[PDB]
Design a protein around this ligand. Structure first.
Ligand SMILES: Nc1ncnc2c1ncn2[C@@H]1O[C@H](CO)[C@H]2O[P@@](=O)(S)O[C@H]21
Ligand SMILES: [Cl-]
Length: 212
């Protein structure tokens, strides 16, 4: 009766490959783009950087969008979240996640997920939540991690996303500094980049628990 490592939406073989493939292409295009190389000094400390190798730590199997990290019940609020009706009712159910953008930072590379109202019901409201969630609506950090730097944890991907969103609401994202096939590229500075997709990418996933 102990909880899983974490709850979340796990993409199907099909959707996972599609998103992973898209993420890779983005890292290759972004790494080659001139506006990116122009700011390489703000990306790494101490040219041409292959981002695919930079984000060497990548999800082993299928991609996923985490909701509540439970650490088998050792995480705060893990017990209260798992006992919600909406969680038990939604357990094993199919969902469609809307990917609105892909982003890159010195620490992580991931995809922004925009949760619908029904999906937000499965989002945690635990006491100890990120502080970057000030003014930004709940579920704003929802994301799919695509890769991380060598000494970075995937939990950082949500934090990086919030920081990027915090900058967009302030109107400091500036105007596109380039234009990729799937959409416009934005430079937010300090090594942060955001590809806003012209057309939202829909991925199919199943809500469930991963027990490691
Ligand atoms: N202390 C923590 N708080 C919230 N999520 C955590 C966490 N430790 C790990 N995770 C997340 O649980 C999942 C597997 O560890 C990953 O999905 P993600 O990109 S949100 O970052 C990871
Ligand atoms: Cl670090």
């Amino acid at each position: 009766d102990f909880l899983p490592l974490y709850f979340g939406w796990f993409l199907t073989k099909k959707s996972s490959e599609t998103l992973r493939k898209a993420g890779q292409v983005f890292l290759e295009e972004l790494g080659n783009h001139k506006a990116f190389k122009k700011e390489l000094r703000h990306f790494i400390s101490g040219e041409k950087l292959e981002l695919v190798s930079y984000f060497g730590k990548r999800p082993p199997g299928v991609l996923s969008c985490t909701t509540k990290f439970c650490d088998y019940g050792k995480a705060a609020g893990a017990e209260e979240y798992a006992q919600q009706e909406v969680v038990k009712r939604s357990y094993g159910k199919a969902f469609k996640l809307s990917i609105s953008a892909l982003f890159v930072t010195p620490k992580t590379a991931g995809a922004q997920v925009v949760l619908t109202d029904q999906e937000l019901q499965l989002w945690p409201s635990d006491l100890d939540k990120p502080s970057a969630s000030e003014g930004l609506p709940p579920g704003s950090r929802a994301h799919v991690t695509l890769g991380c730097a060598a000494d970075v944890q995937p939990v950082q991907t949500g934090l990086d996303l919030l920081d990027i969103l915090q900058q967009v609401k302030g109107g400091s994202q500036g105007e596109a500094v380039g234009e990729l096939p799937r959409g416009k590229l934005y430079s937010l500075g300090k090594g942060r980049w955001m590809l806003s997709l012209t057309k939202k990418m829909e991925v199919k996933a199943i809500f469930t628990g991963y027990y490691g």
